[PDB]
């Protein structure tokens, strides 16, 4: 999908996310807010990684001791990475 698709897909789940601009030529940046309580996750795409692959990899190992009260978000987080690979 396109960076814009991320906004549209995130909008459906009512999540706050943002994308860069000229970063498209090289690598775009995706910022996902895990919790409005100030809890947020930072991820980016590199020629060796992508937001979906990098972001998914960060949570690929599954919910960490980070915060159980935020585990539900992480379970849902995988949906975003699933959306990217959506043709």
Break the chain into its structural domains and give their ranges.
1-87
Nearest to 34 by CA among 80, 1, 83: 80
Q: How far apart are CA 76 and CA 84, in angstroms?
A: 14
Q: How far apart are CA 15 and CA 12, in angstroms?
A: 8
Q: How far apart are CA 1 and CA 87, in angstroms?
A: 6
38: left (phi over 0), alpha (psi -120 to 50) or beta: left
Nearest to 30 by CA among 47, 64, 5, 65: 5
Sign of CA dihedral 33, 85, 60, 43: negative
Q: What are phi and psi of 71, to 5 degrees?
A: -60, -40
Cβ burial of 29 (10 Å; 0-12, 13-18, 19+) is: middle
């Amino acid at each position: 999908m396109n960076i814009n698709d991320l906004i549209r897909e995130i909008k459906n789940k009512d999540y706050t996310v943002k994308l860069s601009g000229t970063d498209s030529n090289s690598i775009t940046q995706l910022i996902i807010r895990v919790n409005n309580d100030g809890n947020e996750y930072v991820i980016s795409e590199s020629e060796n990684e992508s937001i979906v692959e990098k972001f998914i990899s960060a949570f690929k190992n599954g919910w960490n001791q980070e915060y159980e009260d935020e585990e539900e978000f992480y379970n849902d987080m995988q949906t975003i990475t699933l959306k990217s690979e959506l043709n």
